[PDB]
Amino acid sequence: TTIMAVAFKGGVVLAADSRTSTGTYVVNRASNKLTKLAEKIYCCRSGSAADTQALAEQTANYLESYEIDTSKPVNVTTAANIFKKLCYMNKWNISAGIIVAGYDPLNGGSVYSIPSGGSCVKLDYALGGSGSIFLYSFFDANYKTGMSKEECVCFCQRAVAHAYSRDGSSGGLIRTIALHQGEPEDMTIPWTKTPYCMEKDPKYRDLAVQNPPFSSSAKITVNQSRSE
Amino acid sequence: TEHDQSTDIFSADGRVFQVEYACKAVDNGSTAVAACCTDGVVVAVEKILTSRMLEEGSNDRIHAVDRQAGVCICGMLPDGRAVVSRARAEAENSRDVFATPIPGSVLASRIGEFMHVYTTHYAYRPFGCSVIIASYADDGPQLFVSDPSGTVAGYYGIALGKGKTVAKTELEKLNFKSITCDEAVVKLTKILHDVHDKSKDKLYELEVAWVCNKSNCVFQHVPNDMI
Numbered sequence: 468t469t470i471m472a473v474a475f476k477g478g479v480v481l482a483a484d485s486r487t488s489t490g491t492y493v494v495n496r497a498s499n500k501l502t503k504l505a506e507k508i509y510c511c512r513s514g515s516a517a518d519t520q521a522l523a524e525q526t527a528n529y530l531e532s533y534e535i536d537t538s539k540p541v542n543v544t545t546a547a548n549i550f551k552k553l554c555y556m557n558k559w560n561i562s563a564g565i566i567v568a569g570y571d572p573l574n575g576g577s578v579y580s581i582p583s584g585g586s587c588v589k590l591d592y593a594l595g596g597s598g599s600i601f602l603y604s605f606f607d608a609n610y611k612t613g614m615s616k617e618e619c620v621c622f623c624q625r626a627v628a629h630a631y632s633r634d635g636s637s638g639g640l641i642r643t644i645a646l647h648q649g650e651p652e653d654m655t656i657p658w659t660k661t662p663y664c665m666e667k668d669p670k671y672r673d674l675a676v677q678n679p680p681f682s683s684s685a686k687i688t689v690n691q692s693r694s695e
Numbered sequence: 696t697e698h699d700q701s702t703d704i705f706s707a708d709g710r711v712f713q714v715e716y717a718c719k720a721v722d723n724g725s726t727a728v729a730a731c732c733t734d735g736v737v738v739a740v741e742k743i744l745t746s747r748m749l750e751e752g753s754n755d756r757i758h759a760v761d762r763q764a765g766v767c768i769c770g771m772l773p774d775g776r777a778v779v780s781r782a783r784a785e786a787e788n789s790r791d792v793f794a795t796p797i798p799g800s801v802l803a804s805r806i807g808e809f810m811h812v813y814t815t816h817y818a819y820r821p822f823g824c825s826v827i828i829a830s831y832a833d834d835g836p837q838l839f840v841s842d843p844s845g846t847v848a849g850y851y852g853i854a855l856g857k858g859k860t861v862a863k864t865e866l867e868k869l870n871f872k873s874i875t876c877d878e879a880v881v882k883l884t885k886i887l888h889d890v891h892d893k894s895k896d897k898l899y900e901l902e903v904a905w906v907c908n909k910s911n912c913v914f915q916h917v918p919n920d921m922i
Contacts, residue, residue: 533793537801548794573833 469598469630469637470500470511472568473610474591475619478576478647479568481509482623484598484631485639487516496639501653505530507646508546508569513596514562514583522563526550542571547579547587555585564595570646598630598637605629616645624656628663703817713821714814717843720823721770725899726858726890727756728883729767729827731838731851731871735907736829737879738767741856741887744898757904757916761786763796764830765904765914769855775824781809782828799830799837803847811845825855829904831912858890865889876907880921 472481483500486493500512502523508530512519526549534541547567554563565581580593591612594602605626614622624641631637641656656662665671680691698704699712706712727740740756756775757767760782768775785805789797806826813819821843828839840855841847851871854862865886874882880903887901901922906914 537798542795545793545795549792552792 468500468513468596469602469627469634470513470564470566470595471599471602471623471626472511472566472578472593473614473619473623474576474578474612475614475616478570478616478645479578480616480619480623480643480645481511481566481568482627482641482643483511484627484637485642486631486637488636491635493638499642501642501644503527504546504567505534505541505569507571507651508541508543508567509644509646510550510568511566511595513564518561518563519565522550522553522557522561522565525553540571542573543567543569543577543579544574547581547589551581551585551587554581558583558585566593566595568593568646570648572648576647596637598627598634601630601633602626616647620645620654625662628661632663632665701817702814702819702821711814714844717821717823721825721843721855722857722859724770724856725896726854726856726862726887727767727769727827728854728862728866728886729829729838729850729852730866730869730874730879730883731836732874732876732879732907733872734836734909735831735876735905735912736836736838737876737883737903737905737907738765738827738829739880739883739887739901739903740767740769741858741891742900742902743896744900747898755902757902759914760802761790761796761914763832763906763912763914764799764802764828765906767827767829767904768824769827770824771822772824774822775826778806778810778822778824778826782806782826796832797830798832798834799828799839800834800849802830803828803837803839803841803849807841807845807847809845810841810843814843814845827853827855829906829914831906831914836906854886858887858892861890862886876905876909877921880905880917884922 470483472479481501485497487495487498502510502512504510504527510523529549530541530546550565550567564583568578570576578590578593580588580590620643627641644651644653676687676690678690679687698706702713725741725743729738758779759765766779766782786797789795810822814821825842830837839849840853852866884901903917906912
């Protein structure tokens with residue numbers, strides 16, 4: 468799994484891959500890991516599918532009740548706090564890394580990270596899942612604050628493509644959603660139009676020379692392609 | 696006339712007499728007034744002293760329930776103190792679970808719900824206090840009253856207790872859109888000095904509090920020099 472969320476000027480972008488696997492076999496190649504918690508607040512889910520589905524549903528139930536009781540739309544910080552409490556009270560019996568992100572008019576676009584263990588950290592961007600390890604350096608080199616909404620969608624699509632080209636446990640579609648004061652905008656990129664993969668990178672077109680033909684010299688040239 | 700022995704029984708006319716009787720305890724208590732300015736809210740209350748030998752602060756009727764909100768009690772003080780505890784617990788729950796300061800309208804509706812439940816069951820009696828709630832959270836300045844029936848309403852200005860009919864007359868000659876929190880303290884105190892009955896209650900003092908911009912939306916007693 469590869470998940471992330473990034474803040475921009477006046478909102479957030481969430482992004483993910485679409486693969487669910489038992490280790491070496493793909494059970495679903497088109498999962499949806501961006502789960503809605505309220506009109507402008509979403510989470511990204513990693514770890515056990517069963518545990519994350521169950522805690523997202525419970526968090527959403529509590530936010531809907533709260534919103535009816537106050538007659539106002541909820542803030543991102545309230546969703547993060549409710550979710551944190553469920554992750555922390557159940558930490559020994561679950562496998563879950565969560566990112567909560569969204570837009571509200573008090574604080575604008577906000578991103579919170581809730582990793583294994585149940586801590587809660589407020590950031591400018593967050594990464595999660597098996598594929599995150601491939602992206603720390605990509606962001607350290609190429610991320611800046613103050614990107615526009617279109618810059619930020621394009622950047623997150625590229626980041627997800629890099630992680631899934633190297634991580635066997637990620638793959639498939641790239642899903643994104645952008646949350647701001649207007650309406651939410653979702654997008655799905657198919658593998659055939661991915662912005663990066665190893666299979667089409669020209670520096671990996673020519674094969675390594677592992678199988679040189681039997682020769683009278685120690686010079687290494689080409690791979691054998693036909694029987695002698 | 697057996698219909699007035701418990702709060703779990705309607706009368707033939709559709710009334711609940713135990714709740715009416717509890718309201719009569721509030722109407723015989725000391726007077727309170729409050730006003731909602733553009734800055735904040737001010738509350739003031741009359742304390743009838745029972746001895747000239749009390750320390751200052753004894754039997755206080757005004758209590759903070761969060762950083763930005765407070766309550767004033769009319770009628771029976773120990774009953775009021777049980778409501779203050781409940782309110783403190785609801786404000787804490789809102790910070791701990793939802794990460795917000797409790798909005799004023801929500802605090803008032805929980806206090807109402809709590810008071811109402813004691814008008815339904817043969818084994819409990821209704822509270823003999825009315826509570827004034829004053830708050831300034833993300834929903835602006837707000838002033839509410841909850842009575843022994845559990846009915847809750849919002850006001851620009853209000854008076855309770857035995858001086859209330861006259862005090863109401865004088866709150867109607869204020870301009871609520873324009874007034875500041877320093878003017879309000881002078882006007883509200885004046886109303887309370889004027890309705891005091893000097894025959895019946897010989898010793899008294901005033902207690903005053905506010906929450907406003909000047910105070911940084913912190914609910915507190917006014918410094919004793921401003922009276």
